[PDB]
Amino acid sequence: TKRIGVTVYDMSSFITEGKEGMDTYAKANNIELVWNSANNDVSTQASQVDSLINQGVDAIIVVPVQADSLGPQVASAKSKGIPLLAVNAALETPDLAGNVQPDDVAAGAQEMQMMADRLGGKGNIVILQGPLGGSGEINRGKGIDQVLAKYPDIKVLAKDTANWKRDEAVNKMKNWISSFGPQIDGVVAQNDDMGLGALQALKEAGRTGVPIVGIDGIEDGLNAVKSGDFIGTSLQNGTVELSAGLAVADALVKGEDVKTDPVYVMPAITKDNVDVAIEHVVTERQKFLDGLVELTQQNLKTGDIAYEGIPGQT
Ligand SMILES: OC[C@@H](O)[C@H](O)[C@@H](O)[C@@H](O)CO
Ligand SMILES: [Cl-]
Ligand SMILES: [Cl-]
Ligand SMILES: [Cl-]
Ligand SMILES: [Cl-]
Numbered sequence: 001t002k003r004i005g006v007t008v009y010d011m012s013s014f015i016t017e018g019k020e021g022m023d024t025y026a027k028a029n030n031i032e033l034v035w036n037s038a039n040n041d042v043s044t045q046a047s048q049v050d051s052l053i054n055q056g057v058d059a060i061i062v063v064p065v066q067a068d069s070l071g072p073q074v075a076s077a078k079s080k081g082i083p084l085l086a087v088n089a090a091l092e093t094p095d096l097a098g099n100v101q102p103d104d105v106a107a108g109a110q111e112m113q114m115m116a117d118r119l120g121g122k123g124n125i126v127i128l129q130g131p132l133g134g135s136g137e138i139n140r141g142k143g144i145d146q147v148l149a150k151y152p153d154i155k156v157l158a159k160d161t162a163n164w165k166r167d168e169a170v171n172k173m174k175n176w177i178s179s180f181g182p183q184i185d186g187v188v189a190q191n192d193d194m195g196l197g198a199l200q201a202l203k204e205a206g207r208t209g210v211p212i213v214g215i216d217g218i219e220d221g222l223n224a225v226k227s228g229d230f231i232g233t234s235l236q237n238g239t240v241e242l243s244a245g246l247a248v249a250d251a252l253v254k255g256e257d258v259k260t261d262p263v264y265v266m267p268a269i270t271k272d273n274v275d276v277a278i279e280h281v282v283t284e285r286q287k288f289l290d291g292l293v294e295l296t297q298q299n300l301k302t303g304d305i306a307y308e309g310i311p312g313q314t
């Protein structure tokens with residue numbers, strides 16, 4: 001019956017894994033999802049929101065390219081009575097109907113603390129950023145910086161974007177390897193994909209054993225934690241977070257009272273608890289998806305949208 005438009009920045013690993021959860025929730029709730037991807041382009045994404053508005057969908061979910069963007073489109077949707085939500089990354093507009101977000105400051109702090117823990121408080125790092133001007137790099141950078149403020153013997157030799165993408169990260173890391181070589185003691189990657197690119201560049205330079213930390217716990221990232229290729233990650237289960245977003249959208253379409261700004265807190269993932277994450281995200285995906293609608297409705301009650309039973313969670 002309900003038609004809910006989705007425009008995402010790109011089909012990243014996180015979004016790709018999460019789409020299955022969104023689509024599972026939609027099918028269980030009589031929602032047709034209109035999927036669009038903006039391939040990392042703000043104007044494309046603006047055009048997609050315009051189109052969804054023109055189509056008269058019941059609600060719109062934006063996973064934004066840029067935080068400072070889409071003002072006219074979000075004001076249009078609001079003026080027309082179409083609930084528009086930001087999910088997964090932030091928008092600056094005051095007109096959102098819902099706002100379903102990770103705590104990216106916390107996640108950045110957590111990854112940097114994992115690295116500081118590994119290094120014993122001393123060493124030289126490089127930092128791979130998400131797309132500049134997205135809330136993910138802004139907020140993860142703030143949390144990294146909060147932790148760097150405690151460690152005078154940790155030095156950042158370089159920081160740059162690789163736009164969430166593995167192969168950008170390989171090329172950035174190869175330039176830093178040619179500049180700094182074995183002065184690089186660790187890599188803090190703002191997502192797992194970029195950390196895996198760095199891993200590949202280091203391998204091809206003949207370096208194994210360099211500490212790398214990520215964020216997301218995508219399939220390949222969890223496997224990297226299990227194998228020791230990463231020191232840790234922070235779980236951002238897209239099946240969970242994106243389905244939570246859709247559930248807030250669905251409640252707004254139905255006129256129900258709902259918490260419209262729940263926060264997804266990413267649990268730390270290490271070799272101690274990576275098995276369970278592997279079951280949910282890698283080896284037992286379909287069993288997890290069979291449970292997802294129920295998990296989502298329970299968690300929308302507690303507000304604890306990240307709960308999935310990872311060791312360490314409440
Ligand atoms: O670019 C939007 C988000 O910041 C992004 O989807 C991140 O949450 C994710 O960690 C990237 O892999
Ligand atoms: Cl994937
Ligand atoms: Cl699917
Ligand atoms: Cl589907
Ligand atoms: Cl791309």
Ligand SMILES: [Cl-]
Nearest residue numbers: 075093094095
């Ligand atoms: Cl306004």
Ligand SMILES: [Cl-]
Nearest residue numbers: 109110113268
């Ligand atoms: Cl912690």
Ligand SMILES: [Cl-]
Nearest residue numbers: 109110113268
């Ligand atoms: Cl802590």
Ligand SMILES: [Cl-]
Nearest residue numbers: 013218219220
């Ligand atoms: Cl993956």
Ligand SMILES: [Zn+2]
Nearest residue numbers: 010011012039
């Ligand atoms: Zn892409």
Ligand SMILES: [Zn+2]
Nearest residue numbers: 017020285286
């Ligand atoms: Zn699948």
Ligand SMILES: [Zn+2]
Nearest residue numbers: 019020023024
């Ligand atoms: Zn699907």
Ligand SMILES: [Zn+2]
Nearest residue numbers: 041042043044
């Ligand atoms: Zn453009």
Ligand SMILES: [Zn+2]
Nearest residue numbers: 067090091092
């Ligand atoms: Zn902002």
Ligand SMILES: [Zn+2]
Nearest residue numbers: 075078094095
């Ligand atoms: Zn307004």
Ligand SMILES: [Zn+2]
Nearest residue numbers: 103104105106
């Ligand atoms: Zn916080």
Ligand SMILES: [Zn+2]
Nearest residue numbers: 109110113268
């Ligand atoms: Zn911590």
Ligand SMILES: [Zn+2]
Nearest residue numbers: 123124183185
């Ligand atoms: Zn050193």
Ligand SMILES: [Zn+2]
Nearest residue numbers: 132133137138
């Ligand atoms: Zn920035």
Ligand SMILES: [Zn+2]
Nearest residue numbers: 166167170200
């Ligand atoms: Zn590659």
Ligand SMILES: [Zn+2]
Nearest residue numbers: 170200201204
């Ligand atoms: Zn190569």
